[PDB]
Amino acid sequence: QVQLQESGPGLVKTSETLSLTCAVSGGSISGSRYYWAWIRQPPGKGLEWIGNLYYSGTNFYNPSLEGRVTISVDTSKNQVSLKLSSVTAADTAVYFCARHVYYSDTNSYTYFFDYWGQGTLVTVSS
Amino acid sequence: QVQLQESGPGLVKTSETLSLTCAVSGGSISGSRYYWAWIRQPPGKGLEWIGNLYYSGTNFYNPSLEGRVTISVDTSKNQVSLKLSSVTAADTAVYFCARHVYYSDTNSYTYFFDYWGQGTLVTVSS
Amino acid sequence: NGKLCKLNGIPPLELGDCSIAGWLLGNPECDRLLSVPEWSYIMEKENPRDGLCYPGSFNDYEELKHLLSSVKHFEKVKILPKDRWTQHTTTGGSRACAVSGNPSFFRNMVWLTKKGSNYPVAKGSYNNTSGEQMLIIWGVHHPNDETEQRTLYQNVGTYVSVGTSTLNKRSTPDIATRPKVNGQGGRMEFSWTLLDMWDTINFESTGNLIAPEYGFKISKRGSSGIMKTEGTLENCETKCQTPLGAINTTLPFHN
Amino acid sequence: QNVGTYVSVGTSTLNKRSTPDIATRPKVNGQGGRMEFSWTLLDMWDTINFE
Amino acid sequence: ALTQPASVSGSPGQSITISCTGTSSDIGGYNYVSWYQNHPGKAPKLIIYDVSHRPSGVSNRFSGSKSGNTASLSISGLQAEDEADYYCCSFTDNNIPAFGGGTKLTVL
Amino acid sequence: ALTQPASVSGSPGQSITISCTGTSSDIGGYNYVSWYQNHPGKAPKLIIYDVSHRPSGVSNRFSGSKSGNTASLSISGLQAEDEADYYCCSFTDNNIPAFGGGTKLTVL
Ligand SMILES: *[C@@H]1O[C@H](CO[C@@H]2O[C@@H](C)[C@@H](O)[C@@H](O)[C@@H]2O)[C@@H](O[C@@H]2O[C@H](CO)[C@@H](O)[C@H](O)[C@H]2NC(C)=O)[C@H](O)[C@H]1NC(C)=O
Ligand SMILES: *[C@@H]1O[C@H](CO[C@@H]2O[C@@H](C)[C@@H](O)[C@@H](O)[C@@H]2O)[C@@H](O[C@@H]2O[C@H](CO)[C@@H](O)[C@H](O)[C@H]2NC(C)=O)[C@H](O)[C@H]1NC(C)=O
Ligand SMILES: *[C@@H]1O[C@H](CO)[C@@H](O)[C@H](O)[C@H]1NC(C)=O
Numbered sequence: 001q002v003q004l005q006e007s008g009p010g011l012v013k014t015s016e017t018l019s020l021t022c023a024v025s026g027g028s029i030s031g032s033r034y035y036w037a038w039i040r041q042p043p044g045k046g047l048e049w050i051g052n053l054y055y056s057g058t059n060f061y062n063p064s065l066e067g068r069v070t071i072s073v074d075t076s077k078n079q080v081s082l083k084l085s086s087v088t089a090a091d092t093a094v095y096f097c098a099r100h101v102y103y104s105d106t107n108s109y110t111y112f113f114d115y116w117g118q119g120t121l122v123t124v125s126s
Numbered sequence: 127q128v129q130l131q132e133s134g135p136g137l138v139k140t141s142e143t144l145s146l147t148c149a150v151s152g153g154s155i156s157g158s159r160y161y162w163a164w165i166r167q168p169p170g171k172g173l174e175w176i177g178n179l180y181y182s183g184t185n186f187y188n189p190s191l192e193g194r195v196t197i198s199v200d201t202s203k204n205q206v207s208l209k210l211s212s213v214t215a216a217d218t219a220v221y222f223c224a225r226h227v228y229y230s231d232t233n234s235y236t237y238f239f240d241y242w243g244q245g246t247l248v249t250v251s252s
Numbered sequence: 253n254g255k256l257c258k259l260n261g262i263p264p265l266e267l268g269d270c271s272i273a274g275w276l277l278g279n280p281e282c283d284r285l286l287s288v289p290e291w292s293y294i295m296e297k298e299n300p301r302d303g304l305c306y307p308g309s310f311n312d313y314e315e316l317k318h319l320l321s322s323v324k325h326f327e328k329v330k331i332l333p334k335d336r337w338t339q340h341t342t343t344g345g346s347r348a349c350a351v352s353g354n355p356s357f358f359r360n361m362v363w364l365t366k367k368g369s370n371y372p373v374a375k376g377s378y379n380n381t382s383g384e385q386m387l388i389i390w391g392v393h394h395p396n397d398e399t400e401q402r403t404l405y406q407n408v409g410t411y412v413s414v415g416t417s418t419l420n421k422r423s424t425p426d427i428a429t430r431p432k433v434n435g436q437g438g439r440m441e442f443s444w445t446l447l448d449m450w451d452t453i454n455f456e457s458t459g460n461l462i463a464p465e466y467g468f469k470i471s472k473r474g475s476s477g478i479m480k481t482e483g484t485l486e487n488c489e490t491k492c493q494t495p496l497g498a499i500n501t502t503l504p505f506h507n
Numbered sequence: 508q509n510v511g512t513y514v515s516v517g518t519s520t521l522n523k524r525s526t527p528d529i530a531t532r533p534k535v536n537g538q539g540g541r542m543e544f545s546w547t548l549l550d551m552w553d554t555i556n557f558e
Numbered sequence: 559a560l561t562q563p564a565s566v567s568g569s570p571g572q573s574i575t576i577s578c579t580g581t582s583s584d585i586g587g588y589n590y591v592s593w594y595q596n597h598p599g600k601a602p603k604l605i606i607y608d609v610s611h612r613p614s615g616v617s618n619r620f621s622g623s624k625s626g627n628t629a630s631l632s633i634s635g636l637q638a639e640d641e642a643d644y645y646c647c648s649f650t651d652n653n654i655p656a657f658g659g660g661t662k663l664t665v666l
Numbered sequence: 667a668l669t670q671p672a673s674v675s676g677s678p679g680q681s682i683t684i685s686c687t688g689t690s691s692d693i694g695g696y697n698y699v700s701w702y703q704n705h706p707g708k709a710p711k712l713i714i715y716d717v718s719h720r721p722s723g724v725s726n727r728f729s730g731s732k733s734g735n736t737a738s739l740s741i742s743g744l745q746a747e748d749e750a751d752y753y754c755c756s757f758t759d760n761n762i763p764a765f766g767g768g769t770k771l772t773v774l
Binding site: 098111113 | 588590592594596600601602603604607608613643645647648649653654655657658659660
């Protein structure tokens with residue numbers, strides 16, 4: 001029953017850093033069965049995974065969009081956040097946060113995005 | 127006999143972030159009987175508590191002025207610091223740092239601001 | 253004679269269904285043992301029920317049971333009164349130790365939790381001026397998860413530190429999912445020391461501290477022991493007592 | 508990949524959390540590393556968890 | 559990435575299948591294929607996970623299976639309400655998620 | 667916040683009292699009332715703590731007490747040098763400090 005909500009600038013200029021924050025409510029951000037994922041959908045395109053927050057481990061990112069991305073956490077706010085450096089026109093997209101489940105509650109491994117926020121649309125322009 | 131001294135910009139513009147730093151000398155910033163407090167006095171007004179640094183715990187803030195305030199620490203400098211986001215005209219004040227004693231040296235709990243710096247006056251304007 | 257008798261004219265401590273840990277911590281079901289007269293021996297039931305109502309463990313428990321053999325009477329002394337803990341919540345508890353439905357806790361212990369949204373460093377100390385060596389018990393709460401840790405204590409990277417002129421112990425909680433015992437996936441760990449006369453015990457915590465309210469002053473230190481038996485006291489007297497009944501004889505051997 | 512790691516094991520009676528000790532050690536059988544083993548008895552109908 | 563038909567279509571009441579093809583590395587190796595339903599203006603909804611399972615609250619008209627390197631989403635009783643983009647996602651040898659291109663489902 | 671008289675006054679040599687009124691939550695509950703003296707241009711000086719105690723170096727003309735939800739600062743032998751703003755502060759059920767509005771003391 002956890003609610004996820006994205007918030008951030010709907011406009012970032014070319015070559016600046018885009019910073020989006022997802023608030024998590026109705027559940028924790030800490031757990032051993034989950035990763036927090038950032039996913040985006042450019043208009044007219046499919047779903048592209050950006051990267052995961054591994055609260056108790058190390059973060060990992062899409063290898064293409066790797067050198068430009070940082071994912072972090074604020075535990076006093078129960079928020080997770082995404083930063084994309086050197087943004088370009090190609091980075092216009094609806095950005096979503098999601099709860100990515102890798103371990104089930106039936107003593108086995110699984111793999112799915114269970115909860116999604118509704119997303120925030122970000123335009124990149126000059 | 128600890129001396130406290132505030133330092134920072136005497137002018138911040140509207141909607142910017144104000145950042146003030148208090149140096150502590152003649153004593154530690156680490157201890158189990160104290161919190162470091164930031165307090166302000168707008169001209170013509172009384173004393174408003176902003177928030178505390180709890181070195182070994184979590185920080186806590188005035189619930190009105192909560193979403194805009196961060197308090198942190200630099201242990202290499204033996205300094206504590208205050209950041210107020212989205213500053214407005216209402217934030218003009220003399221800002222003070224203080225040693226807030228919550229546990230006495232007589233095996234009991236107490237509650238007072240024992241040491242104060244002299245304060246730094248910050249103007250917020252457009 | 254088939255009976256459990258007073259030994260040398262002094263009745264045993266009959267714990268009924270209580271364990272030693274339940275007794276000393278104050279398990280709510282051991283209320284009849286809150287004020288205890290001098291005893292000649294201890295009658296502990298094998299596999300007692302009223303032990304640690306909040307699931308957990310007790311360190312050096314066998315050594316404590318051994319210590320209590322050569323004790324007989326002791327006095328319960330208030331060392332850290334519950335109401336000294338201002339700026340803390342002292343009313344926590346659990347359904348596991350509930351009394352008449354209502355959540356409760358070990359009666360000689362204070363479960364300190366967050367007040368408002370804060371948990372100030374929990375400090376206090378006691379100087380043993382009671383006249384004799386004192387037994388002090390304390391413990392550490394181990395949450396099932398991080399949410400529980402944050403809910404009870406605002407602080408997460410917590411520690412519990414206890415010490416005397418000889419004791420130097422620092423523990424941290426282990427947050428982990430565990431099988432449930434008595435309905436809880438959490439555990440509470442207890443430990444103890446003896447505070448030498450005229451020494452001082454200090455406590456300090458940023459969370460997960462179960463503080464003593466009381467210590468136990470040893471009063472007699474005579475020779476005794478702990479007997480395992482399901483019987484009761486039968487209003488008779490002996491000089492030698494077996495678990496099966498008392499022996500009245502002058503012969504050199506018995507079977 | 509992770510460095511500040513832990514190993515947690517428990518049952519209705521076992522509550523153990525260990526962390527690795529990274530250190531240079533004399534080599535034994537060609538390795539400067541060590542592997543530490545421990546054991547428990549899992550009572551009938553209980554459950555052992557590893558994390 | 560995984561390959562999906564760009565678009566599929568069918569009449570109300572018919573059963574329609576949306577395929578997703580990968581390699582041995584993603585689909586073939588693991589039984590971790592999941593599917594999402596995405597209506598315009600909304601975040602994706604999980605419909606299928608672990609190849610053939612449904613989350614509580616998901617209609618039983620949705621089902622799925624896999625063979626070799628091909629995964630399949632089956633929608634029986636096609637409704638007007640099912641017009642949506644559908645996506646496949648799976649695990650892979652490189653321990654990161656993989657998404658497919660997406661299929662647009664048009665109900666006639 | 668705690669309520670204080672906006673201003674009080676009296677002649678040199680007289681005893682003057684500055685009150686501070688709160689609820690059961692701050693003043694009534696705890697014996698943690700403290701008072702500060704604040705001269706213009708300087709940081710506040712602690713004069714009283716724990717309702718009636720003074721820090722070393724503080725004049726014995728300062729004292730205090732409480733009754734119910736009301737705290738009181740008493741200044742005997744009023745001096746010209748005592749013109750200052752005075753503030754009350756106390757602890758509270760919500761574990762944060764509470765300050766009063768402040769009283770200006772005028773010496774005539
Ligand atoms: C812990 O307390 C002892 C005992 O204090 C005395 O007895 C108490 C019952 C009470 O009446 C106190 O006011 C007494 O002072 C302290 O030991 C005494 O220390 C003084 C000063 O150095 C010395 O003259 C006495 O002879 C000592 N008495 C004994 C029996 O040793 C001890 O210092 C206290 N510990 C701490 C850390 O404060
Ligand atoms: C661990 O398993 C026991 C036993 O489960 C039963 O026996 C297995 C071999 C298998 O056939 C299971 O499907 C059976 O349910 C669980 O204990 C049982 O719990 C039920 C429900 O409360 C109770 O009615 C039975 O009497 C219990 N049986 C015994 C022997 O105690 C136990 O709960 C499982 N532990 C966990 C954490 O799930
Ligand atoms: C043992 O028996 C004698 C009678 O032979 C009796 O007087 C005495 O009271 C009995 N014992 C004890 C241990 O009190």
